[PDB]
């Protein structure tokens, strides 16, 4: 994630093994109850798209759900591209498949930010809300 | 699409 350090600078830190372990338990215990989303959001404060994909890929054994999540990402990414006539990020850049970590940090700390972590996070949360609904 | 079925999240596409 991008965090404010003690000096007050916005700096990058790797997503921590602690965070990732907590996210593993969340999914394991709770599957897709309403509270999975609050946990996800809390654990992904300041996350880059790289961070978010590390979290997503830890999800094992929920194959249909994770396909629904991909569907949402693809839909949101396609609409992003259509609304951002064709360096500025594309939908695939927001989702981290085609952008580098340094590009992501570059957008996130741009003046004013191009908050790709928050955008991708919005897509994911939209996806998770649809999954949670399905398990209700 | 950005993500193919059974393409991990974040995986750059093979094409």
Author numbering:
A (entry chain A): 1 to 86, 97 to 146
B (entry chain B): 322 to 336
Recite the paper's sentences.
The HIV-1 genome enters target cells encapsulated in a fullerene capsid cone composed of capsid (CA) protein. CPSF6 is a pre-mRNA processing protein that dynamically shuttles between the nucleus and the cytoplasm and contains a C-terminal nuclear-targeting arginine/serine-rich (RS-) domain of the type bound by TNPO3. Here we show that CPSF6 binds specifically to a novel protein-protein interface on the N-terminal domain of HIV-1 CA. Together, our data reveals that HIV-1 CA possesses a previously undescribed, conserved protein-protein interface that dictates cofactor dependence.
We therefore synthesised a peptide corresponding to this putative HIV-1-interacting region (CPSF6313–327) and tested binding to recombinant HIV-1 CA N-terminal domain (CAN) by isothermal titration calorimetry (ITC). CPSF6313–327 is highly hydrophobic, containing only two polar residues (Q319 and Q323). The aromatic side chain of F321 forms extensive hydrophobic interactions with CA, suggesting that it may be essential for CPSF6:CA binding. Mutation N74D is located at the centre of the CPSF6-binding interface and abolishes binding of CPSF6313–327 to CA. We have shown that CA residue N74 makes an essential interaction with CPSF6, both by solving the crystal structure of a CPSF6:CA complex and by showing that mutation N74D abolishes binding to CPSF6. Five residues were selected for mutation (N57, Q67, K70, N74 and T107), on the basis that (1) they bind CPSF6 via their side chain and not their main chain and (2) are not obviously involved in maintaining CA structure. We also made an additional M66F mutation in order to occlude the hydrophobic pocket filled by CPSF6 residue F321. Modelling of this mutant on to our structure suggested that the only F66 rotamer that would permit normal HIV-1 folding would be one that resulted in a steric clash with F321. One mutation, T107A, resulted in an increased affinity to the drug (Kd = 1 µM), possibly due to the removal of a slight steric repulsion between one of the aromatic moieties in PF-3450074 and the T107 side chain. These data show that PF-3450074 occupies only one pocket within a larger protein interface bound by CPSF6. In this context, it is important to note that the interaction of CPSF6313–327 with CA, whilst specific, occurs with weak affinity.
